[PDB]
Design a protein around this ligand. Structure first.
Ligand code: CHL
Ligand code: CLA
Ligand code: CLA
Ligand code: CLA
Ligand code: CLA
Ligand code: CLA
Ligand code: CLA
Ligand code: LMG
Ligand code: XAT
Ligand code: LUT
Ligand code: LUT
Ligand code: CA
Lengths: 743, 97, 221, 42, 208
């Protein structure tokens, strides 16, 4: 009943015995290989711990230490970033003059003439211009020298070592047992209050003492080397009292509850800093303070050892009504015995979170000199969109794996899951209809516009000047937001963003940081295209999950396992009738959706927001509002967006952006290459490998591990992975080359 | 090497000589105590038995439950007798359940 | 035997075989259920005793120099607070016969042999009285109990030849050790948010209590 | 040690070490005799 | 092999590895990474440590005495570190390649016996000369044992071999230290010794 640390001593002895043996976990693998297919299986089931065994304890111990290994990898990556910024960067030069020097923290060796990639990024430096936005983070944290970056790199190196050691320790020396993992009340209490609460309180503590004064000094124009070191701001306090007078009272305001005496550096201004083009740091500090208080209270909800708190089982089984029978009764037993349920929930939430992060970061730029660094903005948005999409697809993959492997109504019965399984056909039919209707009335409008324009009938077109489809709801909402500060958020001075409205354009160094974003008919059309693509990928994934165990087609689909080729060409043909195959499609449709989203973002930003400001306040954008009139027909996307924007990357050869041109072409190649795997089947290939094997045998050079063509599932996997790599990489090259050349 | 192999059987219990590099069922045929079989390739229940003492190598195994290996059952056609083990014959159905 | 804020789970593993056993374990850490690395109860008892011993040493030692810094021939250059000694350079340094880094590595070479030998005795009890160490191994035998090795070195005066002597003496030892541990914690936090030094700070408190903990509420530095 | 020698000769590690050695050799060769479109010695 | 069960260990109180039963000269049970758990590998590494220690003793002499003797004004050997390029009667390449063939043949003879004990012992020109030693790494002979100082019954010889290996380990560390000292500072080893003895508390590696 009570909660304690519970461990096991030396469960597995560290040794090199199993390294010598390839696929020790799989009994069939351990023995050895007869054909080439054995090598592929070895890799495909390396991390599927729940099939190497059946013990939940062993699965969870393996999971814990694998997480430790992953954390170590992440720390090594971070330390590499910091070290490259310390040693092979122009960070100090950029710190002296941010809006003329281009950030770059990677140089290349002059081996085969590749030193042309060491382009002129300014600052007496020649390297590869980076888009990671790391310089902005380091500037917002207060880092002024490269000694601080060196110290950070070494600290992260020793942290990576610590994480690797802890991974070894918690698997080979002191491995917890099942009752320790199956405690989720204390785990939640610690992750809410300890990891997020204390973490954000600690970060607010950093910003209050390091980033606020140092960034004040930097924005006052002081030479970066003439700025006091951060620890001075802690030793000598009147240094802070000068910048921030109310540091004089010194924490007595915090206990007199005269918190208003802190109004100096704990603000609620909102908007952007007109000097840096980022959010006010005195706003971010206040934000993290409030976040910390909220999380610290929130991590006290669940009962662990002292009576007070909430039993999650009680909360769950208290919720049920007349439509759902006994809903939520039995979910606590499901979410604590199967790792795949937890994994899919967390993956869905993390993907949602990543995409929300992308949006909020484009809209409210948090770092100084980030908004006017167009390359960094574009790259960050695109990268986070892709990450979010991939995570969301993985959520569906693991929900299906749960349904196939761990769902059991004999021992772990839940009502809601059962009801959804019982009317899955109604669910999928209505989602099908919605997909069809949405596809007709969003893309059909584009086709109508294209033919109306090609028949010389622009008046009949669905445009801003012929037949207006105005997004009146979005316009109304954003006008409500523009009017918010002072009316219904009285403590704010500026609206939370500048895309809402109110005028108040902000520029930095002759470039536009932000201005109100207008929503017209093209925005309506493309938003409905977005809704359509999201609905279709949801349809595919949900159909895969709901029909993973059985269907009216094949009545015992679970016995065939979560992943399998087919069940023969019977009943008309059952190609890809498995849950894994549904995930394979969803990835295709996720690719489509995210591609359209990032294209929309890039065109709209290069057309209505970014650009150069001038002396009168005349804003010339990258494209003179060509999105409002040209984006309404597909010919406009092919001509004004792809063909026009594509010219930058094509002319990259012979300059320092040549690598982007090379990657453009190479990604085209690998994408086209995927089609060989996606259009063919393994029968032809086995029959061809047969005669190649004959040719080898004729010369006593045939191998003993018999070469087999790939499995049916592996061929689809090779085809989908190559497809995604090709498409994403060509978009990456195009975006980067274009925004670095025109930005 | 050639450890003695004991097999309970409705015919009785006999002892035969056979080298650890060979299957118990294959040398049984050489002596001449008849046992059941069908596929002879380790993929069926026909030649099933279970063990009383010792244990046989599970390397020559396929089409078996991730448990049939350690719960007792085994296939005479695909099995190397690493010791002086005592095994059962005609054991398909109490394996078939 | 009196008990403070005990627990039914805590009482089970805390019956009294250890000195200073007051059944106080509100977070249940000496549980013999989940014994693994560094959570085993014997190791926790050993750690309490060793921390208490080092804390008694450091707690009479950190307050010493600035006391006789007021009484006796002891100069003022030899009269620092415990934080100005060079331990925290950004708070004050000194110039000893060495560098304060060679000082550290010499300190830790000496402490290395002493601590490693002590651990070698914890793990395989009675192993240090076997190998040669310029003689002196017959005195490093041990007594079966790690926290109480005894011998001609660690107990020359022969206190407690009967065992209730040792019982009440161990009780007194661990009590004074807990006192010294929280004394050192007070030293730390007080020297931070008041930044004066404990002895001199105590004298200011004894002038008259106008200068209460709240008074330095304001965190001068 | 014996098992470490074995694992260091497994196919992926053997091939990565082989190809790293080959890459180093070719890189150095073209670092000494760069821009070579022909065989100009004989 | 005299399996010293209670030999003095490097880490008192902890059991030595099984493949280290004290058989080898100066065995103190030091092999944490287990680099010698294979008998063949053990043999090979015994040979390696011996030849390393011998080369390093020759090197420690040739570094530390000439500069300790030219610090005091006896003669004028330049700095051992940059002693490589101070030109001689020929170029370094002619001497290095000439020496490589010379040093190479002897190395080949050692390989011939390390991998096949006692099969190269005799001389290729006058086959009546017969290097003495019966152990690998301890070749004896009139060439390498003219004094016969350690050809006595295997008791003093065993304690003599330990002596050699201990001096050799010290010399390896010494030679590496001189190279590291010469890279960190810009002085000579005797200069570093004299400075650290002039001001021990302050003139150490913690001087930069
Ligand atoms: C054990 C034998 C041996 C050792 C230890 C050294 C060591 C050294 N020689 Mg040297 N030599 C040796 C034999 C011989 N040398 C020469 C001819 C020369 C010349 C002509 C020169 C040296 C130089 C040097 C030094 C160059 C330092 C440097 O940049 O290192 C770089 C370190 C490495 C490359 C090691 C990297 C890691 C390793 C695992 C690979 C160095 C300390 C140079 C010198 O004096 O510089 C000041 C120099 O100019 N030697 C000959 C010809 C007969 C040798 C014959 O045996
Ligand atoms: C305040 C307490 C605390 C804190 C700070 C953390 C923090 C973390 N936990 Mg953890 N956890 C806790 C309590 C805590 N936990 C409790 C009480 C339980 C249940 C008994 C768990 C069970 C648990 C599991 C099962 C897992 C985590 C994981 C993680 C990591 C999540 C990944 C991440 O966000 O990276 C953020 C990166 C950082 C914050 C870098 C700093 C890392 C610091 C040094 C971590 C130190 C905190 C740790 C608890 C110290 C105690 C150990 C100590 C004896 C040395 C993260 C570092 C995941 C993980 O293990 O990842 C490997 C995961 O699998 N936790
Ligand atoms: C975990 C976060 C964190 C940490 C570690 C610190 C640490 C510190 N703060 Mg501080 N502070 C913080 C958050 C934090 N603060 C926040 C969020 C606020 C805004 C409410 C303040 C407002 C504040 C003031 C006004 C003062 C300090 C001061 C101090 C220093 C006084 C030393 C002391 O007596 O204690 C100390 C180093 C004092 C100082 O600056 O020392 C010179 C001081 O006057 N802090
Ligand atoms: C926290 C995230 C997370 C975690 C822990 C897991 C964990 C797991 N997943 Mg999974 N998944 C995730 C996210 C995650 N997934 C996401 C986001 C997706 C959507 C793409 C998927 C989709 C997915 C599928 C379809 C499957 C799994 C499967 C599995 C299980 C086995 C994976 C394995 O060993 O295959 C081995 C890993 C590899 C072979 C790596 C392949 C290399 C990739 C494809 C190339 C990447 C290219 C690189 C980025 C750049 C090019 C480099 C090159 C040019 C040099 C395992 C428990 C498998 C399973 O059966 O579950 C039981 C399964 O089939 N996942
Ligand atoms: C439904 C639209 C809406 C929204 C999104 C907001 C949002 C906000 N208002 Mg606002 N307000 C609104 C309607 C709205 N208001 C209306 C119709 C009025 C009357 C004209 C006000 C009058 C008002 C005042 C007087 C103030 C705000 C303030 C605020 C800000 C602090 C929120 C807060 O107090 O925490 C939540 C408070 C709680 C007690 C938690 C309860 C959760 C709610 C009730 C559900 C916040 C951004 C404060 C501000 O100025 O911001 C700095 C403030 O002073 N509002
Ligand atoms: C493990 C406990 C401990 C530690 C780490 C220290 C550490 C230190 N002591 Mg201290 N001391 C201690 C216990 C301790 N002391 C005890 C128990 C007493 C008696 C109650 C003293 C009495 C004492 C005095 C009077 C002085 C120090 C001084 C010092 C500082 C220099 C000492 C020195 O030069 O080394 C030893 C050098 C030798 C030649 C021997 C140094 C930081 C000196 C100092 O710097 O003043 C602040 C100083 O004058 N100590
Ligand atoms: C072979 C034994 C040996 C000896 C007798 C010395 C002696 C000396 N070294 Mg040296 N050193 C050695 C090995 C040795 N070293 C090795 C292997 C290295 C490579 C890491 C170094 C690298 C080194 C550097 C970079 C420096 C010295 C320096 C010095 C001088 C001052 C010590 C010091 O401050 O630095 C400390 C030296 C070390 C921590 C390395 C010693 C570690 C090995 C294991 C030796 C251990 C000693 C051995 C167990 C007992 C010796 C037996 C007997 C001769 C007493 C001093 C005379 C300093 C100097 O120049 O003086 C101004 C200095 O800058 N040494
Ligand atoms: C890296 C070097 C690994 C050395 C190694 O594994 O061999 C050394 C041994 C393997 O060697 C084995 O050792 C056993 C006792 O430990 C027995 O003596 C066996 O006879 C011996 O073969 O493995 C290790 O001890 C290394 C542990 C992990 C080190 C990292
Ligand atoms: C040979 C050598 C140096 C030879 C140098 C020579 C000849 C130089 C000759 C000179 O002509 C020059 C060139 C210049 C001339 O003007 C002067 C001289 C000087 C005369 C150093 C070796 C130096 C070699 C060293 C220091 C090796 C150290 C190895 C260690 C510490 C390993 C220990 C462990 O491996 C174990 C045993 C067990 C494992 O489980 C754990 C670990 C810890 C891995
Ligand atoms: C019991 C319990 C159980 C439950 O369940 C929970 C809870 C409640 C949490 C718990 C706990 C409580 C507490 C309080 C604890 C604490 C402890 C401590 C304080 C320690 C210290 C401890 C402490 C220590 C060691 C210390 C030591 C110190 C020293 C040596 C010092 C030194 C020095 C000197 C001399 C002087 C110089 O100049 C400096 C120096 C160098 C610095
Ligand atoms: C580091 C440092 C630093 C600081 O500063 C300085 C200093 C001090 C310099 C340092 C230290 C050093 C050291 C320690 C050294 C040591 C060395 C050695 C040990 C050597 C040996 C060495 C040794 C040796 C040579 C030996 C040798 C031997 C021999 C020859 C022998 C020969 C022989 C033979 C065979 C045989 C015959 O029958 C006899 C004879 C003929 C006789
Ligand atoms: Ca415990």
């Amino acid at each position: 009943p009570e909660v304690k640390i519970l461990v096991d001593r030396d469960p597995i002895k560290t040794s090199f015995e199993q390294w010598a043996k390839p696929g020790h976990f799989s009994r069939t693998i351990a023995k050895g290989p007869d054909t080439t297919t054995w090598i592929w299986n070895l890799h495909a089931d390396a991390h599927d711990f729940d099939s190497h065994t059946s013990d939940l304890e062993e699965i969870s111990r393996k999971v814990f230490s694998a997480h430790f290994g992953q954390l170590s990898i992440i720390f090594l990556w971070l330390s590499g970033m910091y070290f490259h910024g310390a040693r092979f960067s122009n960070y100090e030069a950029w710190l002296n003059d941010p809006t003329h020097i281009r950030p770059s923290a990677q140089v290349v060796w002059p081996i085969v003439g590749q030193e042309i990639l060491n382009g002129d990024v300014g600052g007496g430096f020649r390297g590869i211009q980076i888009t990671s936005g790391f310089f902005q983070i380091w500037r917002a944290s207060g880092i002024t020298s490269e000694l601080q970056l060196y110290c950070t790199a070494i600290g992260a190196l020793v942290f990576a070592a610590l994480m690797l050691f802890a991974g070894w320790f918690h698997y080979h020396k002191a491995a917890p047992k099942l009752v320790w993992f199956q405690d989720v009340e204390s785990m939640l209490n610690h992750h809410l209050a300890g990891l997020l609460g204390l973490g954000s309180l600690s970060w607010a503590g950093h910003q209050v003492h390091v980033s606020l004064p140092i960034n004040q000094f930097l924005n006052a124009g002081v030479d970066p080397k003439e700025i006091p070191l951060p620890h001075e701001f802690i030793l000598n306090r009147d240094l802070l009292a000068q910048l921030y007078p109310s540091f004089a009272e010194g924490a007595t305001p915090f206990f007199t509850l005269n918190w208003s005496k802190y109004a100096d550096f704990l603000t609620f201004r909102g908007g952007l800093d007109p000097l840096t083009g980022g959010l006010w740091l005195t706003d971010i500090a206040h934000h993290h303070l409030a976040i910390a208080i909220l999380f610290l209270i929130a991590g006290h909800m669940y009962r662990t050892n002292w009576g007070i708190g909430h039993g999650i089982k009680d909360i769950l089984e208290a919720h049920k009504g007349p439509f759902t029978g006994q809903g939520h009764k039995g979910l606590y037993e499901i979410l604590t015995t199967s790792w795949h349920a937890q994994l899919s929930i967390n993956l869905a939430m993390l993907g949602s979170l990543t995409i929300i992060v992308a949006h909020h970061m484009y809209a409210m730029p948090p770092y100084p000199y980030l908004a006017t660094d167009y390359g960094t903005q574009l790259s960050l948005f695109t990268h986070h969109m892709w990450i979010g999409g991939f995570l969301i697809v993985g959520a569906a993959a693991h929900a299906a794996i749960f349904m196939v492997r761990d769902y059991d109504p004999t021992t772990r019965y839940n009502d809601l899951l059962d009801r959804v399984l019982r009317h899955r056909d109604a669910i999928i039919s209505h989602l099908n209809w919605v997909c069809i209707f949405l596809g007709f009335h969003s893309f059909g409008l584009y086709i109508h516009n294209d033919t109306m324009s090609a028949l010389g009938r622009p008046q009949d077109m669905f445009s801003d000047t012929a037949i207006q489809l105005q997004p009146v709801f979005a316009q109304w909402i954003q006008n409500t937001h523009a009017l918010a500060p002072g009316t219904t958020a009285p403590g704010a001075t500026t609206s939370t963003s500048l895309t809402w409205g109110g005028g108040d354009l902000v520029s930095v160094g002759g470039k536009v940081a932000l201005l109100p974003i207008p929503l017209g008919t093209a925005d309506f059309l493309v938003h409905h295209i977005h809704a359509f693509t999201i609905h279709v990928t949801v349809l595919i994934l949900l159909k895969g999950v709901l029909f993973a165990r059985s269907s009216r087609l094949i009545p015992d689909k679970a016995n065939l396992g979560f992943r399998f080729p087919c069940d023969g060409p019977g009943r008309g043909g059952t190609c890809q009738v498995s849950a894994w195959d549904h995930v394979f499609l969803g990835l295709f449709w996720m690719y489509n959706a995210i591609s359209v989203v990032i294209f929309h973002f890039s065109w709209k930003m290069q057309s209505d927001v970014w650009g150069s400001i001038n002396d009168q306040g005349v804003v010339t954008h990258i494209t003179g509002g060509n999105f409002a009139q040209s984006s309404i027909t597909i010919n406009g996307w092919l001509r004004d967006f792809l063909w026009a924007q594509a010219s930058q990357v094509i002319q990259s050869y012979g300059s320092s952006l040549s690598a982007y041109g090379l990657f453009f072409l190479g990604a085209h190649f690998v994408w086209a290459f995927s089609l060989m795997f996606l259009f063919s089947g393994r029968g032809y290939w086995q029959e061809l490998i047969e005669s190649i094997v004959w040719a080898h045998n004729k010369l006593k050079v045939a191998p003993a591990t018999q070469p087999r063509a790939l499995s049916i599932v592996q061929g689809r996997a090779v085809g989908v992975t190559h497809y995604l790599l090709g498409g994403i990489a060509t978009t990456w090259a195009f975006f980067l080359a274009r925004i670095i050349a025109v930005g | 090497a050639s450890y003695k192999v004991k097999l309970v059987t409705p015919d009785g219990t006999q002892e035969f000589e056979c080298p650890s590099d060979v299957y118990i069922l294959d040398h049984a045929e050489e002596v001449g105590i008849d046992l059941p079989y069908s596929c002879r390739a380790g993929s069926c229940s026909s030649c099933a038995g279970k063990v009383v003492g010792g244990e046989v190598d599970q390397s020559d195994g396929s089409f078996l439950d991730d448990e049939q290996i350690e719960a007792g059952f085994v296939l005479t056609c695909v099995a190397y007798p690493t010791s002086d083990v005592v095994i059962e014959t005609h054991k398909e159905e109490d394996l078939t359940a | 035997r009196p008990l403070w804020f005990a627990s039914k789970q805590s009482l089970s593993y805390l019956d009294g075989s250890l000195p200073g056993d007051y059944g106080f374990d509100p977070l249940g850490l000496s549980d013999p259920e989940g014994t693994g690395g560094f959570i085993e109860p014997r190791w926790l008892a050993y750690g309490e005793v060793i921390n208490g011993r080092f804390a008694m040493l450091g707690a009479v030692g950190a307050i010493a120099p600035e006391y006789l810094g007021k009484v006796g021939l002891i100069p003022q250059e030899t009269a620092l607070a415990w934080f100005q000694t060079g331990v925290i350079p950004p708070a004050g340094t000194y110039n000893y016969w060495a560098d304060n880094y060679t000082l550290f590595v010499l300190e830790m070479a000496l402490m290395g042999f002493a601590e490693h030998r002590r651990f070698q005795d914890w793990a395989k009890p009675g192993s240090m009285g076997k190998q040669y160490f310029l003689g002196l191994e017959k005195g490093f035998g041990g007594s079966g109990n790690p926290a109480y090795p005894g011998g001609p070195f660690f107990n020359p005066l022969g206190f407690g030849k009967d065992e209730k002597s040792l019982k009440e003496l161990k009780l007194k030892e661990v009590k004074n050790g807990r006192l010294a541990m929280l004394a050192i914690l007070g030293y730390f936090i007080q020297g931070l948010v008041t930044g004066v030094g404990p002895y001199q700070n105590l004298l200011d408190h004894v002038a008259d209590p106008v200068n209460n903990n709240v008074l330095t509420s304001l965190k001068f530095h | 040690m014996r098992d470490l020698k074995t694992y260091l000769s497994v196919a992926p590690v053997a091939s990565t070490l082989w190809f790293a050695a080959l890459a180093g050799l070719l890189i150095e060769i073209n670092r000494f005799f760069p821009d070579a479109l022909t065989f100009p010695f004989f | 092999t005299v399996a010293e069960p209670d030999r003095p260990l490097w880490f008192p109180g902890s059991t030595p590895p099984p493949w280290l039963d004290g058989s080898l000269p100066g065995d103190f049970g030091f092999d944490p990474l287990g680099l010698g758990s294979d008998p063949e590998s053990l043999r090979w590494n015994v040979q390696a440590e011996l030849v390393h220690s011998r080369w390093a003793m020759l090197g420690a002499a040739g570094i530390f005495i000439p500069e300790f003797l030219t610090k005091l004004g006896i003669l004028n050997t330049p700095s051992w570190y940059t002693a490589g390029e101070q030109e001689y009667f020929t170029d370094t390449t002619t001497l290095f390649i000439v020496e490589l063939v010379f040093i190479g043949w002897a190395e080949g003879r050692r390989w011939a016996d390390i991998l096949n004990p006692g099969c190269v012992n005799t001389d290729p020109i006058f086959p009546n000369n017969k290097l003495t030693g019966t152990d690998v790494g301890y070749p004896g002979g009139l060439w390498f044992d003219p004094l016969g100082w350690g050809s006595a019954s295997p008791q003093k010889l065993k304690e003599l071999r330990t002596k050699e290996i201990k001096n050799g380990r010290l010399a390896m560390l010494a030679v590496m230290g001189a190279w590291f000292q010469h890279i960190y500072t810009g002085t000579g080893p005797i200069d570093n010794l004299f400075a650290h003895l002039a001001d021990p508390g302050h003139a150490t590696i913690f001087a930069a």
